[PDB]
Design a protein around this ligand. Structure first.
Ligand code: D6Y
Length: 330
């Protein structure tokens, strides 16, 4: 089997991407944030504290004839930005782009933090990291991908995110019309539960390529590109007037600037992030200071190849017995 679904930026800046997901019987369609950096499928629901729901579409398990309470199971998650959610768990039928999993753990939110409430466009998350990160207790649950894997034509999914445009998540097959040249595959470590790999280096604009190992994770659920301070300093040094601002919380630059591209290495291959991809617009409405799409990972503990990097490529998440990652230009 295979699945194929369009993913759409939630706003003009590509701050996140949402993908329609069918849950339950009859189908209830929610727009979820596909996140290769976590491993819980959780949704706004009829159980979510009323004051914490503001415009989201909710899952109502009592209206699904295939929903079953997973007795005694609870979940609680906190993300890198300080946001959080928690609740209980149902199993139900979940379909993505024509691909159906029965008995999927659907984590129903009783509580969500303010940042989730404030984002009316995201009805929940669908985690695509490794199932070892799933927060369901006392019995850990599998991801949608993990559950689907045996039935898929090939044990893979691919991320094809658009720049200011829709893109595609495919399951079970590689669309050879969706990229240019060849796909370069690279080793993955699952030891932290992430799609963790090692980039071979970087270049800034037309500058010379610096060969250097950069360990990080392929994370669709993170908007920006977070890299070592040395690397990030080298990038923003090429932009007149750019600077790190503690009050804003990262590198900003004059909105009148033309940003240089950023190249990252995948083995011997190179993925080029165009300058425009790195512009995340005025820090506040009407400001002439713009927020940068490449930021320091110094205060994170890990480097993160988020959407800024991933949208520049066709990305293969290969979930074979030994998982790997593939990158192609497009
Ligand atoms: C910023 C990173 C490290 C990617 C991240 C991921 C998360 C969510 C989890 N706690 C890890 O899987 C569940 N919180 O921070």
């Amino acid at each position: 089997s295979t699945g194929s679904a369009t993913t759409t930026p939630i706003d003009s800046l590509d701050d996140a991407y949402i993908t329609p997901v069918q849950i339950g019987t009859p189908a209830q369609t929610l727009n979820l944030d596909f996140d290769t950096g976590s491993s819980d499928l959780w949704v706004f629901s009829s159980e979510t504290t009323a004051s914490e729901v503001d415009g989201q579409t909710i899952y109502t398990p009592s209206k699904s004839t295939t929903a079953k309470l997973l007795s005694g199971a609870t979940w609680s998650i906190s993300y890198g930005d300080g946001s959080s959610s928690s609740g209980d768990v149902y199993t139900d039928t979940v379909s993505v782009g024509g691909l159906t999993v029965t008995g999927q753990a659907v984590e129903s939110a009783k509580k969500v933090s303010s940042s989730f409430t404030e984002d009316s466009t995201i009805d929940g998350l669908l985690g695509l990291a490794f199932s070892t990160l799933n927060t369901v207790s006392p019995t850990q649950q599998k991801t949608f991908f993990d559950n689907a894997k045996a039935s898929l034509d090939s044990p893979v999914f691919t991320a094809d995110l658009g720049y200011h445009a829709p893109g595609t998540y495919n399951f079970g097959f590689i669309d050879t019309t969706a990229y240019t040249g060849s796909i370069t595959y690279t080793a993955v470590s699952t030891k932290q539960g992430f799609w963790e790999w090692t980039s071979t280096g970087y270049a800034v604009g037309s500058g010379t390529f610096k060969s250097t190992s950069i360990d990080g994770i392929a994370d669709t659920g993170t908007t920006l590109l977070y890299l070592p301070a040395t690397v990030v300093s080298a990038y923003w040094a090429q932009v007149s007037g750019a600077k790190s601002s503690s009050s804003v919380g990262g590198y900003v630059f004059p909105c009148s600037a033309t940003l240089p591209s950023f190249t990252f290495g995948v083995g011997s291959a190179r993925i080029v992030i165009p300058g425009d991809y790195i512009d995340f617009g005025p820090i506040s409405t009407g400001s002439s200071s713009c927020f940068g799409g490449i930021q320091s990972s110094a205060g994170i503990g890990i480097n993160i190849f988020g959407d800024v990097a991933l949208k520049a490529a066709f990305v293969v998440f290969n979930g074979a017995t030994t998982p790997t990652l593939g990158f192609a230009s497009k």
